[PDB]
UniProtKB/Swiss-Prot annotation, chains B, K:
The keyword Metal-binding applies. It comes from Thiobacillus thioparus. Belongs to the nitrile hydratase subunit alpha family. Involved in the degradation of thiocyanate. GO terms for molecular function: thiocyanate hydrolase activity; transition metal ion binding. This is Thiocyanate hydrolase subunit gamma. Its cofactor is Co(3+). Gene3D superfamilies: Nitrile hydratase alpha /Thiocyanate hydrolase gamma. The modification Cysteine sulfinic acid (-SO2H) is found at C108. Co(3+) binds at C105, C108, S109, C110.
Curated annotation (Swiss-Prot), chains D, I:
It catalyses: thiocyanate + H2O + 2 H(+) = carbonyl sulfide + NH4(+). Keywords: Hydrolase. This is Thiocyanate hydrolase subunit beta. Involved in the degradation of thiocyanate. GO terms for biological process: thiocyanate catabolic process. It is an enzyme of class 3 (hydrolase). InterPro entries: CN_hydtase_beta-like_N (IPR049054), CN_hydtase_beta_C (IPR042262), Elect_transpt_acc-like_dom_sf (IPR008990). GO terms for molecular function: thiocyanate hydrolase activity.
From Swiss-Prot, chains E, H:
GO terms for biological process: thiocyanate catabolic process. InterPro entries: CN_Hdrase_a/SCN_Hdrase_g_sf, CN_Hdrtase_a/SCN_Hdrlase_g, CN_Hdrtase_asu/SCN_Hdrlase_gsu, Thiocyan_Hydrolase_gsu. The lineage of its organism: Bacteria, Pseudomonadati, Pseudomonadota, Betaproteobacteria, Nitrosomonadales. Its cofactor is Co(3+). It comes from the Bacteria. Its EC number is 3.5.5.8. GO terms for molecular function: thiocyanate hydrolase activity; transition metal ion binding. This is Thiocyanate hydrolase subunit gamma.
Curated annotation (Swiss-Prot), chains J, L:
It catalyses: thiocyanate + H2O + 2 H(+) = carbonyl sulfide + NH4(+). Keywords: Hydrolase. Involved in the degradation of thiocyanate. The keyword Hydrolase applies. This is Thiocyanate hydrolase subunit alpha. It is an enzyme of class 3 (hydrolase).
C-alpha cells in the first residue's frame, strides 16, 4: 500500500485550505437567513457536529466555505465537497435551564450541509 | 528524562530516518511557531477602532484584513498553503454595545495560532470546553467579566475550519489615543473573549502558572 | 498554614464523595441499554455541555518535548503523511475514553504521532519498539539525550 | 423534543463513564493514614460549604405524607423533651456517616434518626423497634391497612 | 405499595405515642400548625417596612419584635410556647440597599425561618446549593436569573446557629402609590430567600421543574 | 439511666430559646467592630463552625445572643453559656480565586466566643 | 425461604456498589502529574489481564444471539477473503478499542464494532456510507419493512 | 425490539457484501460450518488414545496429524482450505498423567480449538477466568469442583499465539472393557478444557446457570 | 527482580483504572430509593460474610504502641463499667458508618469509639475532649514531649 | 443529666463470669439439640449479630451453649431479658448456591439467640 | 507523632482524670496482655493428645479444661469476671480424619485471647472475614492447606460469646514425642485452623510483616 | 488511492495452512529444547502477545512449535519477517510471589517468539 503524500500540497499550495475546494460543492442547498434543524445522524467513530446541537433549530448567518466533510477528511476521503454553514442558536433552545433574564444569549458554530434540514 | 521525552525522540528520529520530513523541516516549523504572538491581532483591533473601512473588511473578510497586520494565513506559514491545523479562514467577531463574543473549541483546542500565537493551557482544558457553551455568564464571571443581562453574549465554538478572534468594543478612557496605545491594551484574553480591554492594563490578568519539568 | 489546610481539606473530601460504583466486566448484550450503547460508542472529544465544577484556571509552561511534538505533527501534515483532520480523529477520538482524559493533552498528540507511523506502515511496530529500547539505552549509557539530557 | 431528550440523557450518562483512579479502601494500616486523610475521615459530614460542585437545574418537590409525619414527629419529640434540635442535628446530619448522609434522602435521615433517639435513650429497646417493624409489615401484608398510606 | 419509609414512620410514631413520649393529639396539633405556615406574613413585613420608615428600623434592629406586627410571635405562635424546637426565636431581617443585596442558605443543613416563611424549598436543602452559594454566589444567583452590578455588595448569610433570616429587598420601581397588599403580593418566597428580587406583575416564584411525590400531602 | 424530658420546657416556656439563656454568659469578650480570627479548634464528632471560615479574619457586626455552644448542646451539656457573634468576612479572604471585579462581596455567619481570638 | 435467600444474595451484591474508595477523577492532567507507573499503565495493551486480582463468580453459560453468530461469521469471512488476518482483528478489537469499551461493552459487541471499523479504516466504505447505512437500517425497523431474521415486515 | 447491535450487524454485513468483500453465500457457508462443530471429535480423539498406545503417542507429538483420525483436518475441513482464520492449524494435545493435570485458557482473549471442540463457553471468554486461572488455578479449579493432590503438577496452558489445545485426561477407573463410544461419552467439553475430569456415569458438563439471549440462535 | 517488581506494581495499578459506571449520590429523593437500596443503605456495616473479594497475600503487622494503649483503654473502660464490649462493638463496628468503617484502620475505629463513649455518656463534654486535643498538640509542638511516643 | 450505674456488671459477674452470670435466667429452652431450625429474617436496623448470610437458611442445633441477653439488647444497655443461645450447623450448599457438590460435607457453625429460630 | 497517638493520650488522660479507670488499671491490663500468647493453647492440644480423659473434657467443657494450662477464663484476667471482650465460654473444636475446623469472626476479630494471645493482622481483615465462610477451600489453599474432598471442612464463625481454638489431629511421625515436643508444632495458625501441625515445623508459615511506625 | 492485496494470504496458505506456510522461513533457531531462557521486557506500546506476567521470568523451552511472523508485525500487516516460536514452561513460584510451597510442582506453559528470549 502506497500513500500519495504529495496530493494535498499540490492542490493547496499558493491557494490554501479550504480555498482549494472553492466551487466544488455546487449550488448551496440553503442560504443566509434560512431556519434549519440539526439532524441527529449516527456518530459512530467520528463527527464534528456536537451532540449538544442535535435536534435544535438555528438560523444560517453565513455560508463560510466549501470543503469535504470532516467525517470524510478524517479517513482520507476528500472526493466529495459540500457547503459549510455558520448557524446561530438561541441558548434557550439548547439548554432547558437557561434563564429568561439572558434571553438574548446565543451560540454560533459551523455545520456541513449534510446535517441540515429546512426547519 | 521522562517517558514522553523518550518517545518524542523515538518518533522524531524515526520520521526523519524514513524521510517523512527533514531535521530542517522540524527546525523551520519551530522557528515559525517561535515568531507567533498576539500582537498582530491586537494591532488589527486597534486599526479597526480607528478605521471604519478596515473594520468593515475585518468583519466581512478576516483573511484579507489579516494581511494588513503582516499575517498572511496562506503564505506566512512554511507550507505555503496555511498551517495544517489552523487552516485559512479567520473570522473576526465584532462586539458592540449589545453584543459580546467569547471563543472556544469544545472538540479540542482550535485556536487562530497564525495571528494570535499558542492557546492558553486552560483553553485546552476539558473543563473550559464543557462549561463555556452552556454557562458562559458563569464562566466569564469567574474571569471577572460581567455584562448587562440584555446584552447578547455569543459563544463561538470553533468546530470546523474557521478560527476566530474577538474585536472588543473600544473602552472609555481612550480618547485621543493612538493606534500604538490602543493596541497595548488588547491582550490575548481580550482576543479570546474572557476579558475586555482596559486603559492601563497591558497584560493578561495574573493567574497561577504551572511550571514544566523541562521548559524552554 | 490554616487556610492551606482548609483548601486541601475541601479538595480531599471530594475523593470520599459517596457513589454507587458498578465495575463493568464485559457485560452480556442484554445488559446494554440503548442509552448505554450510545454512551459507549460516543466520540470522546464531544464534551460540550457536560456538567463540570468551577476551577481556578492556570497557565502552563511549555515542555521542550511538547514543542517538539507539535512541530512533528505539523511537519508530518506538511509533508503529506496525514491531514490535521486525520490527526484529530486518531488523537482525540480513537484513543478512547480512558486515555482521552487520563493522559496529558500533548501526551495524546505524541502517542498519535507514533501511531500514524505504524498504522500507515512507514515504520513497523518492531522498529518502533526497537527505537524506544535504543532511546532508553542512550539515556542509561550516559551517551546524552538531545536537548533533554547532556552526554 | 425526543431528540433533545436523548441529547440531555446522553450528556448525563457519559458522566458515569468519567475516567478515574479508583482506589477501594479496605481497612488500611495506620501507616497509610496521612494527617490530611485523618482530618478528612473525621470531618463532620454536614460541613459542605465551599466544596466544588456542578450547576444543576434546581427543582421543587412535593411533600410526601410520610415526610410531613416525620417532621411533626421530630418536632414533637423535641417539644416533649426527648431531645433538643441540636441533639437531632448532630445525630441526623453527622453521626449517620458520609455514605448514608449523601446516599439517602433528606427526610430519610430525619426518620432514621427519630427511630435512633428512641433506642439510644432507651425509651424503646431495639427489640421493640424490630418487632414493631415486623408488625407494620404484617399489617400491610394481611391487608389491614396502614394509616393513610394504604386503606385496609 | 407502601415504601420502607412509610413502614418505619408508622413504627416510630406508634412507638413514641405508646411510650408516652408525645400524644396522638400533639402530632395532629403540630401538623395543623405547619399547615398554617407560609410566606405571606414575611411578605407583609416587607410591605409594611417599605411604607413605614420606623417599622423598617425595627425590622432591621429587632426582627423578633417586628414579626409580632404581622401576627407571628416566634415565642408563642408555635404550640410549644417557647418557639419551635428547630427554628428557635431569633429572626433577623436583612435589608438590601442600592449597594447591598442579601441571599441566605444553611450550609450545614436547611435552617429556615419557618414560623414566618413556611417550609424550605427542595433545592434549598440540596447539598449542591449548600456547597456553591457561599463560594460562587454571583454564578448561582445568575443561574436563578438574578444579576447585580459588580460594585454592589452581595452578602451571603449562612444560618449556622440559632438565628434565622428573611431578606427585605429594595422596593422596585413602578410601585408608586401601591397599597400594602399590592406591594406584599410581589414579595415572593424566593425574594425572601434572596435568589430573586420583587418585580411588578410577578406574584409567584419563577417556574421550575417540580418533582412529584409518590404519595403527596 | 433517666433522661429528663421536662428540663428544657421548664427553662424556656413562655420565654423562648435562646432567650432563656440571657445573662448566663456574663461579660462578652469582644464587641461590635472588633476584628477577630477564627481558631481552627478540633472538629471531632461535632462542630457548627464551618471549615471554610477557619483561620480567616472577619469583623464582628453584632452580639446576637447568649447560648451554650452547639458543641455542648448537641450532647446534652447546657451548663455553660457563652456569647455568639455575627461576623462578616470579605469573600476574597475566604476564596483565593474570588475575582477583584466583585471586591465588595461578603459572607455573614454566627460563631460562638470560644472560636474567636483578637485579630 | 427461596425469596429470603434471593434477597440475601441480592443484598450481598448490592453492598458492593457502596464499597468506600478514594475516587480521583482524571481530567487531562499535566505531564508532571504522570509518573512512570501511570505512563506504563495508561499505555498498556488492554487485553493483557492475566494475573490481575478478581473475585470468585458463579460462572454461567450464555445462549448465542443470532447477531453474535452473524457477527462471528462476518469477521471470519472478512479474514477468509483477505480484508484482514485474525491478528489484525485482535489488535484492533481487543486493544485499539481502549480500556473503557474493552470492559464496558459485550464480548461480541467489540467484534462487531471492529468489523465496522476495518471497513472504514481500509477505506472499503467511507464513514459517510456507514452512517447512511445505519440510518437506512433504522428506517427499515420503523417503516415496518422488517430487518432480516431480527424482525419480520408488518403483518395484518 | 431490534437492538443497536442488530442494527449495526445488518449495516456491516450488507455493506461488506455490497462492496464485494465477501458474498452472502460465503456468510451462509461459514455459519453452516460452525453448525457442524462440536466437542465430539475431541472426545473421540481421547477415547481412541486411551485404547491405542501408538495413537496416544501421535496425539502428544503431532496433534494436527492425530486430529485427522476423528475426521477433523485442521487445514482442509474449514471452508477456507487453509484452516480457520482465527484458530490456525497447530493443535497440541496435552496428556494428563498420574502426576500431571492440564487446564487451558487464553488470557489475551478466547482462543479455543474450535475446529475439533466447537464454540467456547461464555465463562471461558470472561475477564474473570482470564485473570484468575493462570495465578490461582487450584482455587479456580476447586470452584469448578476439581481438586488434585498437592504433589501433582497442575499445568496451566495459556493459548497466546497460534497453538490451540485440548486436554487428554487420564482414563478413570471403572471403564474396563468400555468401547470407544462409551469412553468418549464421558469426555465432556469441560474435560477437554481441563476444568473437569471424566467420570463414569457423567456424560454432560456440570450444570451451571444459563443466561438467556434476547434473540437466540 | 527489578522487572518483576515493576510487573507486580503494574498489575496493581491497572486496578485503579478498572472501568465502571460511577454514579455519585447527592441526597436523592425518596422516589429514587428502591427497597434493595434501602436495605443496602440501612445495613449494619460489620456484616460482611459472603461478600465477594479478591485473593490477597495476607501479612502480619507489628503492633503500634498506641494500638496496645488503645486496646487496654477500651478493656479498662469496660472493666470499670463505662460500657460493655457489646456496646463497644455496636458503636465501633456499626455506628461509625460505611465510609469510616472501611476507610480508617482497625484500631483507629477502636480509639475513635473510646473517645466517643466518654462524650456520649457525658463523662467528658465534647468541649473537654476538644480542649484536651488542643493541649496535646501544643505539648508535642512545644518540644516538651508526649509520654512514651516522643521524649522531650 | 443521666447517671450510669458503673458497678452493676462487676457486682453481678465477679467470680462468676459472663455469660455464666446469666445462667438459669432464660427459663425453659424452646429448642433442643438435634432440632432442625430455620433462621427468621428479622429486621436488623442499627444492630444485629445474626449474619445476613444465615437468613432463611435451615440448620441443625448441635448445642445449647449458654444463656444471655441478646446482643441486640446488650449493645444498647438493656439486659433485663435473657434467652438461650444455640450453636447451629449449616451445610455450605444451603448457604451458597454455587458451592460444589464435590465438597458436599462442608459446613458452617455459628451461634444464634432463640428469637431468630423457628421450627423447620 | 501521629493524630492517633495524640488522640490516644487525650482519651487516656481524660479517662484517668475523670476517674473512669486508674493509671494502675491501665498498667495492669497491659501487663496481662503481655503475658498472653499461643503457648497455653498449644499445651492444651499436646495434653489432649497424650491424655484421652483430658481430651474428652476439652471437647465438652473448654473453660474447665483451660484451667489445666494455667488459663482461668474467669479469674486469670484482672477483672475477675473474664475479659470484657473475650468472655468466658471457650469451646475446643476437635478435628478428626473426617472433620477439620477453621475459625473466623466475620463481624469483627473475635479471638480466644486469654489462651491464644492477640489476633493476626490478616484475621481482622475485611478480606478474610468476607471470604472464609464462603470459599474456605480456596482460602485454605492460599495458606497452603488442602484436605480430601470427602472430609468435612467446618468453618466456625465466632459471632456471639463463644471463642474457639482448633485441636488438630495428631500428625504421623511423632511417636514417643513428649508433651513439649508435641506442643512445639502446634502453632498459632494451627489453633486458628489455617494450618495443620507438622513435625519439624515450629513457627507459623513466613508471611510479609508490615512494620509499625512506633512498634511495641 | 491505497490498494490492499486481498488475495495474498489465501494464495500462500491454501492447501498448506497457517503457520505451516511459513515453515523454513526463520532459518536456524537461536535456542533449542531444554534451554533456560529469560523473557525480555520489550516495549509493548500499541500491541504485544507476550503477557506482562511473564516479563523478567525465567523458564525452560520444551518445544519449537513452529515458524511465523511475530504477532507484533502480523497485526499491522507486516509479514516480511518470520521467526521461531517456542513453548516455554514456567514454575508458578517464579511468576507469583505468594504461590504456596505446598503446590511446589505447579507450572504454566505458553508460547513466545524468539525476539523476547535471551539466555538465562
Ligand atoms: Co480544537
Ligand atoms: Co439547616
Ligand atoms: Co483468545
Ligand atoms: Co470479632
Amino acid at each position: 500500500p502506497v500513500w500519495d503524500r504529495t496530493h494535498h500540497a499540490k492542490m493547496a499550495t499558493g491557494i490554501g485550505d479550504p480555498q482549494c475546494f472553492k466551487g466544488m460543492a455546487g449550488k448551496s442547498k440553503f442560504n443566509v437567513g434560512d431556519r434549519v434543524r440539526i439532524k441527529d445522524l449516527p456518530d459512530l467513530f467520528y463527527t464534528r457536529t456536537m451532540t449538544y446541537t442535535r435536534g435544535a433549530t438555528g438560523t444560517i448567518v453565513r455560508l463560510v466555505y466549501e470543503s469535504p466533510a470532516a467525517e470524510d477528511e478524517a479517513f482520507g476521503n476528500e472526493e466529495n465537497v459540500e457547503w459549510f454553514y455558520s448557524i446561530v442558536f438561541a441558548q434557550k433552545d439548547l439548554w432547558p435551564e437557561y434563564s429568561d433574564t439572558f434571553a438574548n444569549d446565543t451560540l454560533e458554530t459551523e455545520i456541513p450541509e449534510r446535517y441540515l434540514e429546512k426547519a | 528524562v521522562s517517558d514522553f521525552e523518550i518517545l518524542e525522540m523515538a518518533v522524531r528520529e524515526l520520521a526523519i530516518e524514513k524521510g517523512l520530513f527533514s531535521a530542517e523541516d522540524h527546525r523551520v516549523w519551530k522557528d515559525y511557531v517561535h515568531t507567533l504572538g498576539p500582537l498582530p491581532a491586537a494591532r488589527l483591533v486597534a486599526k479597526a477602532w480607528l478605521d471604519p473601512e478596515y473594520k468593515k473588511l475585518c468583519i466581512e473578510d478576516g483573511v484579507e484584513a489579516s494581511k494588513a497586520v503582516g499575517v498572511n494565513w496562506v503564505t506566512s506559514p512554511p507550507t505555503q498553503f496555511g498551517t495544517p491545523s489552523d487552516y485559512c479562514n479567520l473570522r473576526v467577531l465584532a462586539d458592540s454595545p449589545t453584543l459580546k463574543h467569547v471563543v472556544v473549541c469544545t472538540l479540542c483546542s482550535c485556536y487562530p495560532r497564525p495571528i494570535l500565537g499558542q492557546s492558553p493551557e486552560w483553553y485546552r482544558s476539558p473543563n473550559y470546553r464543557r462549561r463555556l457553551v452552556r454557562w458562559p455568564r458563569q464562566v466569564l464571571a469567574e474571569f471577572g467579566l460581567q455584562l448587562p443581562s440584555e446584552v447578547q453574549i455569543r459563544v463561538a465554538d470553533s468546530n470546523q475550519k474557521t478560527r476566530y478572534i474577538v474585536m472588543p468594543v473600544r473602552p472609555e478612557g481612550t480618547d485621543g489615543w493612538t493606534e500604538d496605545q490602543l493596541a497595548e491594551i488588547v491582550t490575548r484574553d481580550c482576543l479570546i473573549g474572557v476579558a475586555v480591554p482596559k486603559p492601563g492594563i497591558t497584560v493578561n490578568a495574573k493567574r497561577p502558572v504551572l511550571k514544566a519539568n523541562r521548559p524552554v | 498554614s490554616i487556610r492551606e489546610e482548609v483548601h486541601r481539606h475541601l479538595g480531599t473530601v471530594a475523593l470520599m464523595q459517596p457513589a454507587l460504583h458498578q465495575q463493568t466486566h464485559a457485560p452480556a448484550p442484554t445488559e446494554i441499554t440503548h442509552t448505554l450503547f450510545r454512551a459507549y460508542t460516543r466520540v470522546p472529544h464531544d464534551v460540550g455541555g457536560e456538567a463540570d465544577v468551577p476551577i481556578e484556571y492556570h497557565e502552563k509552561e511549555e515542555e521542550i518535548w511538547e514543542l517538539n511534538t507539535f512541530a512533528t505533527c505539523e511537519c508530518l501534515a506538511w509533508r503529506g503523511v496525514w491531514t490535521a483532520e486525520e490527526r484529530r480523529r486518531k488523537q482525540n477520538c480513537d484513543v478512547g475514553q480512558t486515555v482521552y482524559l487520563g493522559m496529558p493533552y500533548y501526551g495524546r498528540w505524541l502517542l498519535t504521532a507514533a501511531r500514524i507511523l505504524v498504522d500507515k506502515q512507514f515504520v513497523t511496530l518492531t522498529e518502533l519498539h526497537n527505537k524506544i529500547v535504543e532511546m532508553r539505552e542512550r539515556v542509561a549509557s550516559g551517551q546524552g539525550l538531545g536537548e533533554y539530557l547532556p552526554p
